[PDB]
Amino acid sequence: SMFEQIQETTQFIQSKITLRPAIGIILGTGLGALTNELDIDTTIPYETIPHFPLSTVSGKLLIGTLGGKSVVVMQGRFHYYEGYTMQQVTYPVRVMHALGIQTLLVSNAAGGMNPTFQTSDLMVIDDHISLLLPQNPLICPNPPIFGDRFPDMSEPYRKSLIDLAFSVAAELDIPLKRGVYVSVTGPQLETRAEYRMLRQWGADAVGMSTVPEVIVANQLGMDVFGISVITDLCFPDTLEKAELVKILATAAQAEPKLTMLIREMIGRL
Amino acid sequence: SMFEQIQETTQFIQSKITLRPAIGIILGTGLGALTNELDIDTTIPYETIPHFPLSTVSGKLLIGTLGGKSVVVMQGRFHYYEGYTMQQVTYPVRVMHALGIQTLLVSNAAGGMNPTFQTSDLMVIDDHISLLLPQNPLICPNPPIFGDRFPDMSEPYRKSLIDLAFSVAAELDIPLKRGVYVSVTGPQLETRAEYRMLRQWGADAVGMSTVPEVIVANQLGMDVFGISVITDLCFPDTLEKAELVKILATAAQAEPKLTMLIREMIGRL
Amino acid sequence: SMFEQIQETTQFIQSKITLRPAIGIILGTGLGALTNELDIDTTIPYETIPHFPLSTVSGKLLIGTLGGKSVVVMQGRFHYYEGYTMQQVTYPVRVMHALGIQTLLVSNAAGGMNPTFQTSDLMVIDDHISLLLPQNPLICPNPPIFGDRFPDMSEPYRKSLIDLAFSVAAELDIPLKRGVYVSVTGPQLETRAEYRMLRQWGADAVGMSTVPEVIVANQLGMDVFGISVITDLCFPDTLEKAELVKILATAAQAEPKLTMLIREMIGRL
Ligand SMILES: Nc1ncnc2[nH]cnc12
Ligand SMILES: Nc1ncnc2[nH]cnc12
Ligand SMILES: Nc1ncnc2[nH]cnc12
Ligand SMILES: [Cl-]
């Protein structure tokens, strides 16, 4: 079944690694610098991994040491706007679960709709809105092997990990924001009317990923921490043209702070 | 076509029954007690019915007498979160239509977002929000054999049936609420941010069913009455973990009142 | 690929035509009268066009002269509620692009939710809400041959074309409204609760088309102008039953003004 696929994937991964990570990190598009801070023990290209989706817009699974602990890092992820199903988008999370990963740190780039946000701000995700997503990764003809049929979503981002983020940030003098993330499919950016409405719904930041992974991670009983880099501002009255290159550059600008935050958080787990 | 399938299904059902019900009832998950009040003339397991979807999370069609009238009762229904298409979810409604059912009573369990609601409250559905549903049961390459191409939805829950509910409830001293139901796919429950936004949109109760059936029933010209059992409270500031067992228990608590209400309504039609 | 299909389609069209239109017009359902004002040089039934979707609820591509300029007119379009994929819905726009069309004028019928709107009003679309659409025409496994991967949507309806509309309308004494259009799938009309919520989101008019085309046109770098005929009023407190025949009749009522507006706009380009 899906269980047999996951077994095959994890068996392949276990044959390459000797570390036993209990922590996993999904790096957002344009946020690969963390891998430089990582003492890399094993590198596994996505193309070699059984049942992983082929050819992402290379993709690498890295196993090594960070903040004095064993971690697995996904460099590259699968996006719904690339034409992957939600099951493919979230397959790596199921794999991390079966590897024994208990804590998942997810980062992404997002548009800031909160008026106090500036480009390059780091925003801890304390909640999300998932209801715009057109396909749900939990819709399966059969009940789950692991977890509840109808998982509770009253705390999808674990409070202790949010508090830890803020503790570390205060200690390192990293300004840190928090708020509600809303997932859209993309790939087109949002209209002015859309930004206005999303803000009115209570969203602080909008992005094109992450939420499916967090849903699956919570259903599987993992502890999740999520963080957005604010790469562009989405104030509809003063909205200008956004450009992928500027978004990537802005993401890169914030990476040193993000890397430092994440390393020190892991160090403290 | 789909017409030929429906014929085959109804032909099979007609071969088992001798009653001529003009009233149909869809029982929500965790609300089977009504079948005890039913004088059952015929029992038809879902697994034996041509073109019905296989294996629900048994499923029975019961034909008998309730409130002095012939009725058909669906014990068990098909949910989008179980992986059925919207066409499969609503196929039983098309079948009831072709059987000659004119009045449809639909019940479900829902989360209460209206601050005056308490667990076990009965809420008459006076309107719904369907726009979060990711697939629409009316999207067909061919125009419908029965009904309008673009059906009006200014009164999806017939006023006379709502008034009747309230009349019966006052007479039996059953407290009765009313409000707007919003359908989500699930199967995960909603986040705090999601509950806040849904309430802000004007929803009173949120559930994972019913709306597709009501859309098809209205398109087919049937009279619909809908009622939710409030099984859990969804006030986002004071939200606690929900559990399937507690939701089912709460549903069961409300069933005697619901059964009494429904029997006396049917008695009065 | 999709590129080869488009080539085949355009090659077929080029073999029938001798004009070189740089302007394209998509006529909304119930708004065919513009073709009477058109000096028709070539008529191409949809059924003969390679890779066009078969059998619409005839369909014709007309090439001719209007407002002293060469134009292509789509009489008949493909709707998501008819069971076509979003790729099929927007294929004609890709074809117009490959024909060299730079300016696209799109018209439709819509329900008016702005309290100042009356039936037969013309409303220029100055922005849209696309996030209810369940499938996105840009979700492709491969990056686009033309355009950006993540197109900006800060100005999906070109300001100069909106200003031109208003200039022409003032000159011809045509009252003209403007506002935000929201796309829904249909085919059922909206409930009272839905009209209330859509208005609250900031929509002025709601319809069952157009947005997919505008997204693709903008991604392909075309200039878009959009206009709705308000065919029915959607004030939820005073909502009455809508009927397709009355909607079509109302659309027809507004056509002379719309045709005059469009001809004089094209004349001025
Ligand atoms: N404005 C935006 N909208 C959606 N996703 C984004 N990712 C980064 N910026 C974004
Ligand atoms: N809170 C809730 N959300 C969605 N569906 C439900 N069914 C019962 N309770 C529910
Ligand atoms: N009220 C309405 N809703 C959706 N689409 C429409 N097209 C015309 N009127 C409409
Ligand atoms: Cl709102």
Short mmCIF file of N, CA and C in Angstrom, two decimals, chain B residues 58-135:
data_model
loop_
_atom_site.label_atom_id
_atom_site.label_comp_id
_atom_site.label_asym_id
_atom_site.label_seq_id
_atom_site.Cartn_x
_atom_site.Cartn_y
_atom_site.Cartn_z
N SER B 58 -21.58 -0.27 7.79
CA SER B 58 -22.25 -1.13 6.81
C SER B 58 -23.04 -0.31 5.79
N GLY B 59 -24.05 0.42 6.29
CA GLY B 59 -24.92 1.24 5.44
C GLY B 59 -26.20 0.52 5.06
N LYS B 60 -27.34 1.09 5.44
CA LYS B 60 -28.62 0.46 5.14
C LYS B 60 -29.68 1.44 4.68
N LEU B 61 -30.46 1.00 3.70
CA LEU B 61 -31.66 1.70 3.29
C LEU B 61 -32.83 0.99 3.96
N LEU B 62 -33.61 1.73 4.73
CA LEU B 62 -34.73 1.14 5.45
C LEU B 62 -36.03 1.75 4.95
N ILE B 63 -37.01 0.91 4.62
CA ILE B 63 -38.31 1.40 4.16
C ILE B 63 -39.36 0.97 5.18
N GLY B 64 -40.13 1.92 5.68
CA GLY B 64 -41.13 1.59 6.69
C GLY B 64 -42.07 2.73 6.99
N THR B 65 -42.68 2.67 8.17
CA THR B 65 -43.68 3.64 8.60
C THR B 65 -43.16 4.46 9.78
N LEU B 66 -43.35 5.78 9.69
CA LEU B 66 -42.99 6.69 10.77
C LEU B 66 -43.96 7.86 10.72
N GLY B 67 -44.45 8.26 11.89
CA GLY B 67 -45.46 9.31 11.99
C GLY B 67 -46.67 9.05 11.11
N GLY B 68 -47.06 7.78 11.00
CA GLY B 68 -48.22 7.38 10.21
C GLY B 68 -48.06 7.48 8.70
N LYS B 69 -46.83 7.69 8.24
CA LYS B 69 -46.54 7.81 6.80
C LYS B 69 -45.41 6.89 6.34
N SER B 70 -45.44 6.52 5.06
CA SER B 70 -44.37 5.74 4.44
C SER B 70 -43.14 6.61 4.22
N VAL B 71 -41.98 6.13 4.66
CA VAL B 71 -40.71 6.87 4.51
C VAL B 71 -39.59 5.93 4.09
N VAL B 72 -38.54 6.49 3.49
CA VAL B 72 -37.30 5.77 3.25
C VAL B 72 -36.22 6.44 4.11
N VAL B 73 -35.40 5.63 4.77
CA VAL B 73 -34.36 6.14 5.65
C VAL B 73 -33.02 5.61 5.20
N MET B 74 -32.08 6.53 4.98
CA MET B 74 -30.71 6.19 4.69
C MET B 74 -29.97 6.16 5.99
N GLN B 75 -29.58 4.97 6.42
CA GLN B 75 -28.74 4.81 7.61
C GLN B 75 -27.30 4.59 7.18
N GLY B 76 -26.51 5.66 7.26
CA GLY B 76 -25.17 5.67 6.69
C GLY B 76 -25.20 6.53 5.44
N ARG B 77 -24.17 7.36 5.28
CA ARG B 77 -24.02 8.16 4.08
C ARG B 77 -22.57 8.19 3.61
N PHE B 78 -22.36 8.79 2.44
CA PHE B 78 -21.05 8.79 1.80
C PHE B 78 -20.44 10.19 1.95
N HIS B 79 -19.21 10.25 2.42
CA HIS B 79 -18.59 11.54 2.67
C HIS B 79 -17.47 11.82 1.68
N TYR B 80 -17.40 13.05 1.21
CA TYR B 80 -16.29 13.47 0.37
C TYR B 80 -14.91 13.15 1.02
N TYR B 81 -14.79 13.32 2.33
CA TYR B 81 -13.49 13.05 2.97
C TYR B 81 -13.12 11.57 2.95
N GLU B 82 -14.09 10.70 2.68
CA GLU B 82 -13.80 9.27 2.53
C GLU B 82 -13.24 8.94 1.14
N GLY B 83 -13.11 9.94 0.27
CA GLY B 83 -12.56 9.68 -1.06
C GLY B 83 -13.60 9.42 -2.14
N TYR B 84 -14.88 9.56 -1.81
CA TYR B 84 -15.93 9.42 -2.83
C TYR B 84 -16.02 10.71 -3.63
N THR B 85 -16.37 10.62 -4.91
CA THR B 85 -16.61 11.82 -5.70
C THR B 85 -17.90 12.45 -5.21
N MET B 86 -18.13 13.72 -5.57
CA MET B 86 -19.41 14.40 -5.23
C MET B 86 -20.58 13.73 -5.94
N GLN B 87 -20.34 13.12 -7.10
CA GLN B 87 -21.40 12.38 -7.81
C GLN B 87 -21.83 11.14 -7.01
N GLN B 88 -20.87 10.45 -6.40
CA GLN B 88 -21.17 9.32 -5.54
C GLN B 88 -21.83 9.77 -4.24
N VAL B 89 -21.32 10.85 -3.65
CA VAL B 89 -21.91 11.39 -2.43
C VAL B 89 -23.42 11.65 -2.61
N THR B 90 -23.80 12.16 -3.79
CA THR B 90 -25.18 12.58 -4.01
C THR B 90 -26.04 11.59 -4.82
N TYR B 91 -25.44 10.51 -5.28
CA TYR B 91 -26.19 9.47 -5.99
C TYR B 91 -27.44 9.00 -5.22
N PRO B 92 -27.32 8.74 -3.90
CA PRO B 92 -28.54 8.35 -3.20
C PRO B 92 -29.68 9.37 -3.30
N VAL B 93 -29.35 10.66 -3.35
CA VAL B 93 -30.42 11.65 -3.48
C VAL B 93 -31.14 11.54 -4.84
N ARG B 94 -30.36 11.33 -5.89
CA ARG B 94 -30.92 11.10 -7.23
C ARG B 94 -31.81 9.87 -7.26
N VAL B 95 -31.40 8.84 -6.53
CA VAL B 95 -32.19 7.62 -6.40
C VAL B 95 -33.51 7.88 -5.66
N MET B 96 -33.45 8.62 -4.55
CA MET B 96 -34.68 8.95 -3.81
C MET B 96 -35.64 9.72 -4.69
N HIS B 97 -35.13 10.73 -5.39
CA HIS B 97 -35.91 11.46 -6.40
C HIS B 97 -36.64 10.51 -7.38
N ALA B 98 -35.91 9.54 -7.94
CA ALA B 98 -36.47 8.66 -8.97
C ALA B 98 -37.45 7.65 -8.35
N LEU B 99 -37.33 7.45 -7.04
CA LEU B 99 -38.29 6.64 -6.30
C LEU B 99 -39.60 7.38 -6.06
N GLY B 100 -39.61 8.68 -6.30
CA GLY B 100 -40.81 9.47 -6.05
C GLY B 100 -40.79 10.21 -4.73
N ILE B 101 -39.63 10.26 -4.07
CA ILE B 101 -39.51 11.02 -2.81
C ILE B 101 -39.61 12.51 -3.13
N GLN B 102 -40.51 13.22 -2.45
CA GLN B 102 -40.70 14.67 -2.69
C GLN B 102 -40.15 15.53 -1.54
N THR B 103 -40.13 14.97 -0.33
CA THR B 103 -39.66 15.70 0.84
C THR B 103 -38.46 14.99 1.42
N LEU B 104 -37.39 15.75 1.63
CA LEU B 104 -36.16 15.19 2.13
C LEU B 104 -35.79 15.86 3.45
N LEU B 105 -35.57 15.04 4.47
CA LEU B 105 -35.13 15.52 5.78
C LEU B 105 -33.71 15.06 5.98
N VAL B 106 -32.82 16.02 6.20
CA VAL B 106 -31.40 15.72 6.31
C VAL B 106 -30.92 16.17 7.68
N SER B 107 -30.22 15.29 8.38
CA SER B 107 -29.64 15.63 9.67
C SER B 107 -28.12 15.43 9.62
N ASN B 108 -27.40 16.16 10.48
CA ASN B 108 -25.96 15.98 10.61
C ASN B 108 -25.45 16.42 11.97
N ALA B 109 -24.16 16.19 12.22
CA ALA B 109 -23.47 16.74 13.38
C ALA B 109 -22.65 17.93 12.91
N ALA B 110 -22.56 18.97 13.73
CA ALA B 110 -21.79 20.16 13.34
C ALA B 110 -21.15 20.80 14.55
N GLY B 111 -20.06 21.54 14.32
CA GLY B 111 -19.47 22.43 15.32
C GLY B 111 -20.25 23.74 15.44
N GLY B 112 -20.54 24.17 16.67
CA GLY B 112 -21.33 25.40 16.88
C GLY B 112 -20.40 26.59 16.98
N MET B 113 -20.65 27.63 16.18
CA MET B 113 -19.84 28.85 16.25
C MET B 113 -20.64 30.03 16.77
N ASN B 114 -21.96 29.95 16.70
CA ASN B 114 -22.83 30.93 17.34
C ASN B 114 -22.64 30.88 18.87
N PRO B 115 -22.28 32.03 19.51
CA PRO B 115 -21.99 32.03 20.96
C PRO B 115 -23.12 31.58 21.87
N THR B 116 -24.38 31.63 21.41
CA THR B 116 -25.53 31.16 22.21
C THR B 116 -25.74 29.64 22.16
N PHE B 117 -25.02 28.94 21.29
CA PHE B 117 -25.20 27.48 21.13
C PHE B 117 -24.53 26.71 22.27
N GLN B 118 -25.16 25.61 22.68
CA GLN B 118 -24.57 24.68 23.65
C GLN B 118 -24.50 23.30 23.02
N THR B 119 -23.61 22.44 23.52
CA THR B 119 -23.52 21.06 23.00
C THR B 119 -24.87 20.36 23.19
N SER B 120 -25.28 19.58 22.19
CA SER B 120 -26.58 18.90 22.14
C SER B 120 -27.74 19.75 21.63
N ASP B 121 -27.53 21.06 21.40
CA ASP B 121 -28.58 21.90 20.75
C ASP B 121 -28.94 21.37 19.37
N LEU B 122 -30.22 21.49 19.00
CA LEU B 122 -30.66 21.21 17.63
C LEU B 122 -30.76 22.53 16.87
N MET B 123 -30.13 22.61 15.71
CA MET B 123 -30.17 23.83 14.89
C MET B 123 -30.74 23.53 13.53
N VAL B 124 -31.91 24.11 13.27
CA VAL B 124 -32.52 24.05 11.93
C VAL B 124 -31.63 24.83 10.97
N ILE B 125 -31.37 24.24 9.82
CA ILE B 125 -30.55 24.91 8.82
C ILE B 125 -31.49 25.77 8.00
N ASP B 126 -31.35 27.09 8.11
CA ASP B 126 -32.20 27.94 7.27
C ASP B 126 -31.52 28.45 5.99
N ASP B 127 -30.19 28.28 5.90
CA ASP B 127 -29.40 28.62 4.70
C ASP B 127 -28.03 27.96 4.78
N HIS B 128 -27.27 27.96 3.69
CA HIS B 128 -25.92 27.40 3.75
C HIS B 128 -24.91 28.20 2.94
N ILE B 129 -23.64 27.91 3.19
CA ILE B 129 -22.53 28.41 2.39
C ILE B 129 -21.85 27.18 1.77
N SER B 130 -21.80 27.13 0.44
CA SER B 130 -21.30 25.95 -0.27
C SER B 130 -19.98 26.18 -1.00
N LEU B 131 -19.49 27.41 -0.97
CA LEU B 131 -18.43 27.84 -1.87
C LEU B 131 -17.04 27.34 -1.49
N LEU B 132 -16.90 26.74 -0.32
CA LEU B 132 -15.62 26.08 0.01
C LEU B 132 -15.51 24.66 -0.56
N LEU B 133 -16.60 24.12 -1.08
CA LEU B 133 -16.54 22.75 -1.53
C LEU B 133 -15.75 22.69 -2.84
N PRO B 134 -14.79 21.76 -2.93
CA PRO B 134 -13.79 21.83 -3.98
C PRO B 134 -14.29 21.23 -5.29
N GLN B 135 -15.39 20.50 -5.23
CA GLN B 135 -15.95 19.84 -6.39
C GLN B 135 -17.46 20.07 -6.23
#
